[PDB]
């Protein structure tokens, strides 16, 4: 129904800010310290947990909320930016990716 088509454009629409966010995360994986590239994929992390907190999807919400606590912390030099913090990174948003794939 016209409802289905909802859920079905709201979770395309996650899932081209998630490819956005692993595009910006190639980048980054080139030069760490680029704070540009951090800081667009805040922004994008924040456009999607908005949505996921309107849509009532709490799992992966907390996921987000969990990411957006790790590139803040890159963006106010709270730490290093590493390799290993970009895999953690990677591995919480194929968390998000998952979780997000039980919704269709």
């Known amino acids: 129904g016209s ?3 909802y859920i079905k454009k709201v979770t395309d629409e996650l899932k081209e800010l998630i490819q956005n966010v692993n595009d910006d995360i190639k980048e980054v994986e080139k030069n760490p310290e680029d704070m540009e590239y951090w800081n667009k994929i805040y ?6 947990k908005e949505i ?6 709490s799992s992966v919400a907390k996921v987000l909320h969990t990411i957006m606590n790790l590139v803040d912390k890159m963006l106010n ?10 895999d953690k990174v990677k591995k919480k948003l194929d968390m998000v990716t998952r979780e997000l794939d039980k919704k269709v």
């Open 52 to 57: 996921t907190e309107t849509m009532g999807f």
């Open 77 to 86: 030099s709270e730490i290093k930016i590493t390799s290993d913090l970009i």
């Open 3 to 5: 409802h289905q088509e």
């Open 43 to 48: 922004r994008l992390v924040h456009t999607m």
